[PDB]
């Protein structure tokens, strides 16, 4: 398993070479296509030759040229390596994705930090670590070898330093097996822990945090990532293998047209269940180590408008965030789910009346009135915030537009006591939707705990992606979350 078939920094040249040398027919690998931010390439050996297949991620999905569309590259591979999945060529014959060709490079791992000091290691471990926290860094005393550092357990706690020797392309600790990549070695002692002769077990629980920062020191972090963003984004993307939960309910043939794209589905364990019980959406509630919940969803189709309002209804949601400026093109349907001003409309047994539109600059706010037909006592106010100034390509160049908006959504939500989840949507309800939610969770924490709070951008996202697949799609979205957060900080300090 894992994303070992992902190669962060090889080339089309090296890809073909690796595939023709240490690869057989059916072998394959993935690599960022670079050149265009969001592009990827899946290189495949079939007829004793390598073929290259574009994968496009603009803001909303991973599009396999040739195949279909997915929420994460992991899910893409899973679907073809296992499951019903057949990549068909121009003719109509199969392109077999049998054998992941594993990457030896450990750069995109949370535990690998490269050139770091030996005291700087203990520096971090002491401050930001707990039991079973660990990291792998380049040796400098030898050098060339590696040092694995673990925190075990003042005085009750300690730190230990295991030298990893690189010899003839193979890795080892000083005894026992030797390994093909660092990841192999780490993944092996994660499962078969080392034991000290005096009984101390060397648990490699979780890697140490290099992304958790003090909200005050944000200007002095962005510049670092700028000056890298994509370097932190790939380490994020590499976690996506622990989040391949089943999405069975969406794959039902009776539920297939209720989805925009048949392979972009909600997790079974967090899907919204109706009571015909199916809508492409998941609850998102933020957990850490009372609050405000969200629902992430796709913009309703011709055949789900009704179910959309049942959801809004049964979930007591009183705020709706529509992140797209306009209802979708003729491609893949979508509908207008709200009444014109001073109008009312009935979506099945759900009636909704538009009592006031307020046109701002970045957004229209529509005060609506939701109720079941026949039950004027079920009526409640629902607030549709419709963001209008999100570019067709990329992300806004000004983060203030989205911040104000979000500031306004927060206040509306907090205005109502005991309201349900905030409903946030876009075309797929993973890219744009996930961007808005993450920023709204980050800012809430800064609102709550002031500018002196430690915050972790990728942990927050990974935490979200556990509840709906592929929340935040692109490096562009990642970096925008950092700019928006940073922007809120330097206005908050005033």
Curated annotation (Swiss-Prot):
Tissue: Widely expressed, with highest levels in heart, brain, and skeletal muscle.
Residues where Phosphotyrosine is found: 61, 65
Pfam family, one: SH2
Effect in UniProt of substituting residue 68 to K: In JMML; also in myelodysplastic syndrome
GO cellular component: cytoplasm; cytosol; mitochondrion; nucleoplasm; nucleus; protein-containing complex
Result after altering residue 261 to C: In NS1 and LPRD1; does not affect subcellular location; decreases protein tyrosine phosphatase activity against CDC73
Mutation effect (residue 477 to E): In NS1 and LPRD1; does not affect subcellular location; decreases protein tyrosine phosphatase activity against CDC73
Resulting phenotype, residue 473 to P: In LPRD1; does not affect subcellular location; decreases protein tyrosine phosphatase activity against CDC73
PTM entry text: Phosphorylated upon activation of the receptor-type kinase FLT3. Phosphorylated upon activation of the receptor-type kinase PDGFRA. Phosphorylated by activated PDGFRB.
Impact when changing residue 435 to M: In LPRD1; does not affect subcellular location; decreases protein tyrosine phosphatase activity against CDC73
Effect of residue 282 to S: In NS1; some patients also manifest giant cell lesions of bone and soft tissue
Domain SH2: 5-101, 111-208
UniProt-listed Enzyme Commission number(s): 3.1.3.48
Effect of substituting residue 465 to W: In LPRD1; reduced phosphatase activity
Effect of residue 426 to S: Abolishes phosphatase activity. Enhances interaction with NEDD9
GO molecular function, one term: molecular adaptor activity
Keywords: Acetylation, Cytoplasm, Deafness, Disease variant, Hydrolase, Nucleus, Phosphoprotein, Protein phosphatase, Repeat, SH2 domain
Class of this enzyme: hydrolase
Keyword field contains Transcription: no
Residues modified to N-acetylthreonine: 1
Outcome (variant: residue 59 to V): In myelodysplastic syndrome
Subcellular location: Cytoplasm; Nucleus
Protein role: Acts downstream of various receptor and cytoplasmic protein tyrosine kinases to participate in the signal transduction from the cell surface to the nucleus. Positively regulates MAPK signal transduction pathway. Dephosphorylates GAB1, ARHGAP35 and EGFR. Dephosphorylates ROCK2 at 'Tyr-722' resulting in stimulation of its RhoA binding activity. Dephosphorylates CDC73. Dephosphorylates SOX9 on tyrosine residues, leading to inactivate SOX9 and promote ossification. Dephosphorylates tyrosine-phosphorylated NEDD9/CAS-L.
Similarity section: Belongs to the protein-tyrosine phosphatase family. Non-receptor class 2 subfamily.
Disease: LEOPARD syndrome 1: A disorder characterized by lentigines, electrocardiographic conduction abnormalities, ocular hypertelorism, pulmonic stenosis, abnormalities of genitalia, retardation of growth, and sensorineural deafness. Noonan syndrome 1: A form of Noonan syndrome, a disease characterized by short stature, facial dysmorphic features such as hypertelorism, a downward eyeslant and low-set posteriorly rotated ears, and a high incidence of congenital heart defects and hypertrophic cardiomyopathy. Other features can include a short neck with webbing or redundancy of skin, deafness, motor delay, variable intellectual deficits, multiple skeletal defects, cryptorchidism, and bleeding diathesis.
Protein name: Tyrosine-protein phosphatase non-receptor type 11
Annotated organism of origin: Homo sapiens
Gene: PTPN11
